[PDB]
């Protein structure tokens, strides 16, 4: 993925402090794995995945939406089990806003309906024969100003001769203007082709002209202007003997400075082979045409974007059954391809258990788990939001992301303020026995908890823990995947001259022994491993016992005298 | 064996800092604490019914080889004469060398004892004892 | 619980002192357990559970009914022991009163017959082009009057032209204000388009209009009148030059000034798009429709609300058998669901024993206890409140919710001034053995009390003290709740491989060891504890001795003449 | 500490207002002086310290006590942070050490009792190159303003 935002350039060393209603929010904690999310979200590039390490970046780029709330749940659900790093992509295919005034085509780095609230305009600076720019993004209150735009340096001819003329030629094939010739009294001193080579930069031209005993080229102090020579503007017969002759690169100066604006991009209008529409001052005018578009009917293309990213957990912020099928098919493809993943899903408000069974009937896959409960969460700024299940799914996903590989989410507490429905003991049993993960409520003397009763996937059979309990299957997944990638490097990747089946067997046993020494695996059979080699291919087979968690306790009391 | 994979803090992995500088030629550092724990006893039974905490005592020790420059006396972190009354509290941090993450911090350190030795063929050894107000281990998570 | 109704924040720092004849008749005492009740109440809204802490709040919330009489005793049944936190809920489905006149609908948050006594009217004020509103409520003596309602800051024009015209225009699909314009003569000068920005705020509009050289904007003298421009009434061609133009929002300003005043709430009538009808003045009108419904034959839906709310010692305020049947089944399920409940009941003005035997035959659940006596209590007001048995049960329940865990209600005093019935020793013995609570009168040396003879429940078999008596059951209920929570946390979220029988046994002994130090139990046979473990399942058996209580004594006398 | 309810030397005033007038005047955001007499003991008092700013939702804006203490706090903290950090190399500095410094500063501040207790955990930092960002949470100093009492005579 792409970490979108690099540093802001700074100007002065200082410490500034400002009161506010809200702070920087959460932060991504250290994690073995990564958490992928997709949802409605304002800001950012559509069909592009962004990596987030802090809530500040999420605010700065994913400017608003339920997605940003989901990130808050991921890191705010539990400080101890804070969720790890994040990969995010907005479902909405937003559009940029555009303005085409004053010889300039102006477009928004922002995508969405917000983009139409951007205003940009040029102004004429009579003081130095120059153009002036102002950029205001009203929603973020971001104001920018540039002045003396285009004027690089001034030339004076000091001799007594009658006339000194400055000329610049134009190439119509490419629309460039790449010559600069100084003539005095119908005689020429030098000519500088601005097509690279001898005079690629204006710096050399200034040095060249200054060497001429009868001329002086002097640098304008208002803004760094060391532009390449090819960016100089069309100039025709300017009298050098006069008070001041300006050398101009209006777009070149704009091109450099405006690259640092945080809101805008600039293009030079070609007339509608058509010559250039002159860049001229114009009123500060709104950009237009920026919209959010519509979401696609199918999210398969979006999911395919996450292939080869390593995000074990993926959560779609939706309740659509078809979307769930798309993810399940996608996860199935990646798992066979060599990229294991798990999907967490939950739909609607207070949905009927029969409808939950309807989803279970339609969908029975160990790679996915279905959450049933819907509730409300208290979040930053004191606002409490009542939300569907797929937001609860994020809390489960954020929790599972923070937990270690060998530890299940089973029975762990949750911070959710309240739930729509309080399932009974029998109600909970029916869900769990049918492969539905739910939340349980308990009350202390003066405390209340919401707990995750157990780990269960949509797959119903209790025969095989790896199929049923995602925690067990996850432990197997990371074990094998980490092993194979290491094995690929040693033998396939690294140049190996020779190899035998027994050598592979020893390496495997060495790997497993290390895991036990790290407590990642409790026990295993050493003699069960099998290795077969056939030309350029090898087959490896082995078994490891899954970890077993503590589930049931039964107690009885007897009262007696004395 | 490797730098990152070793689960145990060797002396090499640790770095000691004071006031935005590392302490050169450090040799040892010890921190001791007493919660002033006591037992509750009554007439009914000999066994202590409960335990409670009374007073908090916290001290840290440091040893160093006297450099020709940047010693505690030279650096002002420690004082010999009456100038001590003009010295404020100091905060010490013990740091992970790899990432400059914090391992433990001592707040409000003030000096108790200062010892110095010279000998024919040994290296000059500088020792100092600090008493502090509190010790905290936060910002790790 | 549903939160108690709020109060207006602080206005000014001061010391408010006043005099009332009744004042506070009681308040909550420090407690852990909670006390629950249901009955007839004139106030609040139905099918709602409220948290009660002080008598005045309940009195204001519930203006009249048997509830307060029951509540008053609970917080005063004993000088030392008081019920503490209380949950209450009215049975009957009352409805508010309503009135719909002159483009407005008036409704009272209070539900009941008394709401019909609320009188509300609108008057026209020609001195300011506004309406007045008056409210009268005789029973609560609540009166409110407001003047200059519906006026927003005015505009005036200063130029030469023959006319200056102002208008407010509305959205056709919402009736909201969309645009308001200022015009000079035959030409337009400015307009504000209601799409966010400064156009929403009249404060900004005052500044913007004042900035116009020919227009003036000035505010009303009667306090703040700021309102969003969205609420402004539609106005057309308001002449600005000759006289100042009044900006109108009758609905918006009325709602703010009549804010709070929960006795009355306002809805704007959709004229039979249903347009927003114009508001008209109308004479003071008594509201109608305020009613108190009938209680259904089944309160089970009402009772289910108390589930998962941490209540204890419920008391239904009714004598009829149907209610007692429901609660007995209800508490049974609460015990099953790990939230045990106990109940105390009464049979009315029975004043006889034979009816009780029939009732005790009907009810023998250990979780319910029956009281026989009925008597008179003196309130704070001094009314000779002659009440049925089930009101006396409240006094017992109020005492019990205050008493500590390990002590019984037996032989403790009571506030009761007098009783309808006093029984013989044989009658008490037969009544007590039947499993019915009674109150006895004791007088010696001119010192009179009324005492609880026993705490036995409706369950018959004396062979099971845990079933028969409250002291064993109450302490047992809390013990298992505490032990159950600790065991679930310690064991469930851990690996089976590191857990075994012996460690489980040590944990239990430590738990019972610290319990014994607190003296909440008698000594226990530590050796008797033993465990079995198999896979994810474990079984435990333990032996413990209860807390005894000394009941009867025997003495004899002998005179030796010396 | 605030100027609220403290006395004044003034011998007499031109105006004395009603309770409702004071309430409206105070809520408008204007300071007033009230006359109090009881048991033949007369003072003139400052009713409140509210400023011209209107929104009660921002105590840091509305009232002097929050703003005055806040102004000095930031001035002291700002100076210390500039000295400690600015004139030092970035390579030996990190987020965690910054976090510890803040807690120590707020720790010693709390001992002096100039502030109420603070949620130490809420402090968190970000570092990037020569730039760093900090957010913290702190609770203010409260002040008790209004009370309510009632009386009852039971004839005994």
TrEMBL record, chains A, C:
<feature type="region of interest" description="Disordered">
    <location>
        <begin position="1"/>
        <end position="24"/>
    </location>
</feature>
<protein>
    <recommendedName>
        <fullName>Major tail sheath protein</fullName>
    </recommendedName>
</protein>
UniProtKB/TrEMBL annotation, chain B:
<dbReference type="Pfam" id="PF26461">
    <property type="entry name" value="Phi812_tail_tube"/>
</dbReference>
<dbReference type="InterPro" id="IPR058640">
    <property type="entry name" value="Phi812_tail_tube"/>
</dbReference>
<protein>
    <submittedName>
        <fullName>Capsid protein</fullName>
    </submittedName>
</protein>
């Amino acid at each position: 993925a792409v970490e979108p935002f690099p540093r802001r350039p700074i100007t002065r060393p200082h410490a500034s402090i400002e009161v506010d209603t809200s702070g920087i929010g959460g932060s991504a904690g250290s994690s073995e794995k990564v958490f992928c999310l997709i949802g409605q979200a304002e800001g950012g590039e559509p069909n592009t995945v962004y990596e987030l390490r802090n809530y500040s970046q999420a605010k700065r780029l994913f400017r608003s939406g339920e997605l940003l709330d989901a990130i808050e749940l991921a890191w705010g659900s539990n400080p101890n089990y804070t969720a790890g790093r994040i990969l995010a992509m907005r479902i909405e295919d937003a559009k940029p806003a555009s303005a085409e005034i004053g010889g300039l085509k102006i477009t928004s780095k922002i995508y969405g309906n917000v983009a139409n609230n951007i205003q940009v305009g040029l102004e004429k600076n009579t003081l130095s024969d120059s153009l002036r720019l102002r950029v205001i993004f009203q929603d973020d209150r971001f104001n920018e100003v540039y002045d003396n735009i285009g004027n690089i340096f001034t030339i004076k001819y000091k001799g007594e001769e009658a006339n000194a003329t400055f000329s610049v030629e134009h190439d119509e094939e490419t629309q460039k203007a790449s010559r600069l010739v100084l003539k005095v009294g119908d005689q020429e001193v030098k000519s500088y082709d601005l097509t690279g080579g001898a005079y690629d930069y204006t710096n050399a031209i200034i040095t060249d002209i200054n060497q001429l005993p009868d001329f002086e080229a002097k640098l304008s102090p208002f803004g760094d202007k060391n532009l390449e020579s090819s960016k100089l503007d069309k100039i025709e017969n300017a009298n050098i003997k006069d008070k001041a002759v300006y050398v101009k690169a209006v777009f070149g100066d704009l091109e450099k400075q405006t690259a640092y604006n945080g809101i805008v991009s600039f293009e030079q209008l070609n007339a509608e082979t058509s010559p250039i529409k002159t860049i001229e001052p114009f009123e500060l005018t709104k950009l237009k045409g920026g919209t959010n578009g519509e979401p696609p009917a199918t999210w398969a293309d979006k999911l395919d974007k996450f292939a080869h990213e390593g995000g074990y957990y993926i959560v779609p912020l939706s309740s659509k059954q078809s979307v769930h099928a798309e993810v399940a098919s996608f996860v199935k493809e990646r798992s066979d391809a060599g990229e294991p993943m798990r999907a967490i899903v939950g739909g609607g408000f207070n949905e009927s258990k029969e409808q939950l069974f309807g989803r279970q009937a339609s969908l029975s896959n160990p790679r996915v788990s279905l959450v049933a409960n819907s509730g409300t969460f208290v979040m930053d700024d004191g606002r409490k939001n009542h939300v569907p299940a797929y937001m609860v799914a994020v809390a489960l996903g954020g929790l599972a992301s923070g937990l270690e590989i060998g530890e299940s989410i089973t029975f762990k507490p949750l911070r959710v303020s309240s739930l729509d429905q309080i399932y009974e003991s029998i109600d909970l049993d029916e869900l769990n026995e049918n492969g539905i993960i739910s939340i349980e409520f308990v009350r202390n003397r003066t405390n209340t908890f919401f707990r995750i009763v157990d780990d269960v996937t949509t797959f119903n059979d209790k025969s095989d823990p790896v199929k049923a309990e995602m925690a067990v299957g996850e432990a197997n997944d990371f074990l094998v995947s980490e092993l194979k990638v290491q094995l690929e490097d040693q033998f396939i990747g690294t140049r190996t001259i020779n190899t035998s089946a027994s050598i592979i067997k020893d390496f495997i046993q060495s790997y497993l022994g290390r895991k036990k020494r790290d407590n990642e695996i409790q026990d295993f059979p050493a003699e069960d491993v099998q290795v077969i080699v056939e030309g350029n291919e090898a087959r490896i087979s082995m078994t490891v016992y899954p970890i077993r968690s503590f589930k049931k306790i039964s107690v009885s009391l007897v009262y007696k005298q004395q | 064996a490797s730098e990152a994979k070793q689960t145990v803090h060797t002396g090499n992995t640790v770095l000691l800092m004071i006031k935005g500088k590392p302490v050169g030629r450090a040799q040892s550092a010890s921190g001791q604490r007493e919660y002033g724990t006591t037992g509750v006893y009554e007439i009914g039974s000999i066994m202590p019914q409960e335990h409670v905490y009374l007073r908090y005592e916290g001290t840290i020790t440091v040893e160093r080889l006297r450099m020709k420059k940047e010693n505690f006396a030279d650096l002002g972190y420690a004082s010999l004469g009456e100038e001590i009354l003009k010295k404020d509290i100091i905060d010490i941090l013990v740091v992970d060398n790899l990432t400059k993450q914090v391992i433990i911090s001592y707040h409000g350190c003030s000096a108790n004892n200062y010892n110095e030795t010279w000998q024919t063929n040994e290296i000059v050894t500088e020792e100092i004892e600090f008493s502090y107000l509190t010790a905290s281990d936060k910002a790790r998570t």
